[PDB]
Amino acid sequence: EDPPACGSIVPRREWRALASECRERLTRPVRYVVVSHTAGSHCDTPASCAQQAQNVQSYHVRNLGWCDVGYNFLIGEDGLVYEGRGWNIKGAHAGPTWNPISIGISFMGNYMNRVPPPRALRAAQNLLACGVALGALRSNYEVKGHRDVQPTLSPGDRLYEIIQTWSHYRA
Amino acid sequence: EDPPACGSIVPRREWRALASECRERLTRPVRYVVVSHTAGSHCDTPASCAQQAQNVQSYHVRNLGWCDVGYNFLIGEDGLVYEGRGWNIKGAHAGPTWNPISIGISFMGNYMNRVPPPRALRAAQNLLACGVALGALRSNYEVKGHRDVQPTLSPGDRLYEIIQTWSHYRA
Numbered sequence: 001e002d003p004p005a006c007g008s009i010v011p012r013r014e015w016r017a018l019a020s021e022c023r024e025r026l027t028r029p030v031r032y033v034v035v036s037h038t039a040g041s042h043c044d045t046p047a048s049c050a051q052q053a054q055n056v057q058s059y060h061v062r063n064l065g066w067c068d069v070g071y072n073f074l075i076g077e078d079g080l081v082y083e084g085r086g087w088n089i090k091g092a093h094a095g096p097t098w099n100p101i102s103i104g105i106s107f108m109g110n111y112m113n114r115v116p117p118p119r120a121l122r123a124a125q126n127l128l129a130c131g132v133a134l135g136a137l138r139s140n141y142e143v144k145g146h147r148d149v150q151p152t153l154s155p156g157d158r159l160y161e162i163i164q165t166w167s168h169y170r171a
Numbered sequence: 172e173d174p175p176a177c178g179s180i181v182p183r184r185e186w187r188a189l190a191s192e193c194r195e196r197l198t199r200p201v202r203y204v205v206v207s208h209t210a211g212s213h214c215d216t217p218a219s220c221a222q223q224a225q226n227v228q229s230y231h232v233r234n235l236g237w238c239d240v241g242y243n244f245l246i247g248e249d250g251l252v253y254e255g256r257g258w259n260i261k262g263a264h265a266g267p268t269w270n271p272i273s274i275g276i277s278f279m280g281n282y283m284n285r286v287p288p289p290r291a292l293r294a295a296q297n298l299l300a301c302g303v304a305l306g307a308l309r310s311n312y313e314v315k316g317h318r319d320v321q322p323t324l325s326p327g328d329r330l331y332e333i334i335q336t337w338s339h340y341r342a
Binding site: 044117130132 | 175176177178179180181185215216217218249250251288289290292293294296297300338
């Protein structure tokens with residue numbers, strides 16, 4: 001099938017995700033990666049983070065009326081990546097101009113007066129490289145924050161700083 | 172000479188490992204991977220799994236007199252991989268005819284009547300894919316259960332069947 005691979009991603013069903021209704025595809029290979037924070041509660045164990053992913057999706061689908069959680073990927077302080085829309089489905093995280101050219105990843109928590117643990121940061125970087133190896137991301141993809149993209153206070157000041165120091169980062 | 176896209180690994184100093192006294196190196200690329208289980212306590216959070224790794228190393232170093240934790244890598248039920256002796260150092264997990272030609276990875280727990288969670292299995296599998304990309308493991312590496320190379324219950328009855336289904340498995 002999808003033999004347990006690429007990016008140690010927690011599958012949708014494992015975090016009890018509502019089935020998606022999104023159909024819009026993304027054109028492979030994606031050039032951009034936009035990083036953001038949820039401004040929601042944070043979590044530091046697989047159990048609590050799977051519940052947090054369900055909580056974020058519930059808000060997006062039930063209250064905002066979206067086809068699925070808006071991010072392509074969610075990152076938890078448990079150091080695991082959670083499958084959102086994924087690699088081949090357009091997301092709702094960075095406006096009408098980006099959503100079609102990127103993969104959107106978000107850290108579950110508020111990184112205003114906080115910084116995600118090293119394990120969360122490693123998960124993020126594990127995920128992307130996996131994207132390249134699949135052909136979903138261009139080998140020389142560029143990483144942007146949610147400030148460089150849209151009028152926002154996310155991915156959080158302390159997190160924006162770290163992302164800036166990244167090899168594939170583009171001002 | 173190939174550094175790419177490969178993985179999240181909780182480094183030694185993050186799980187507060189005693190320094191290693193090991194010096195004997197492995198011959199790249201390694202052909203075999205022996206999967207075992209510690210037959211000790213399991214953990215399902217980063218906090219408790221870092222502690223458990225420290226505990227297994229404690230046992231190996233302090234009680235058995237080895238130069239470091241015997242396994243090259245350890246897998247926690249929190250879904251994270253913990254750096255042991257790593258890809259370049261000979262381990263102590265499968266006896267003298269196998270220790271010098273294999274990478275030993277151990278799941279923290281006892282799997283005679285329990286299976287590791289999907290996230291643990293994914294971490295392990297993605298770790299191996301990483302070994303290959305790194306040139307640390309042969310592209311045609313073979314996975315063996317501890318019991319295939321040594322008289323023991325390890326890696327546990329329930330975990331042994333799962334791995335019997337892995338793509339690179341060879342009894």
